[PDB]
């Protein structure tokens, strides 16, 4: 571990940097579809019902 070492560090830091893009993809979608369909905070939780489904859907 003492002489490879850092490729696990950038792998750990890469997955940390990825999940904030995932909420960035979530909020940019949840602000876009809520212009006409639903409201601001609720339509985020509406798509939470989509993602928590254990099945295929629309």
């Amino acid at each position: 571990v003492q002489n490879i070492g850092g490729i696990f560090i950038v792998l750990a830091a890469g997955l940390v940097l990825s999940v904030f893009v995932a909420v960035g993809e979530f909020l940019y979608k949840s602000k876009k579809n809520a212009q006409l369909e639903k409201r601001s905070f609720c339509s985020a939780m509406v798509e939470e019902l989509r993602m928590s489904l254990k099945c295929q859907r629309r």
Binding site: I7, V10, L11, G14, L15, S18, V21, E25, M51
Partner: protein, 96 residues
């Protein structure tokens, strides 16, 4: 964590449906069986039929590729050294 993001990212949900997209189609190709197959398929330098969309899953695929680029490259460096046979140790090593 690729499966967690690909079941949370609202851009991986894609319609295959190539003719003319109507409604009520979209579905992830990242099942939990499939996400190991991208992890193993990239680790073995061969690549999969799975290729991510949806930038949050691209970054996981981006950093796992650079992970397995170095591990395979570090493995082939020392492998020239460790392919030398060792003769058998003698069954005695001291007066005892």
């Amino acid at each position: 964590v690729l499966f967690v993001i690909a079941r949370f990212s609202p851009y991986e949900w894609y319609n295959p449906h190539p003719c003319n997209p109507d409604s009520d189609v979209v579905e992830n190709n990242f099942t939990l069986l499939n996400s190991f197959w991208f992890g193993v398929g990239a680790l073995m330098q061969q690549g999969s039929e799975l290729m991510p969309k949806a930038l949050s899953t691209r970054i996981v695929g981006g950093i796992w590729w650079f992970f397995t680029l170095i591990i395979i490259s570090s493995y082939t460096a020392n492998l020239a050294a460790f392919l030398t046979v060792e003769r058998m140790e003698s069954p005695i090593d001291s007066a005892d």
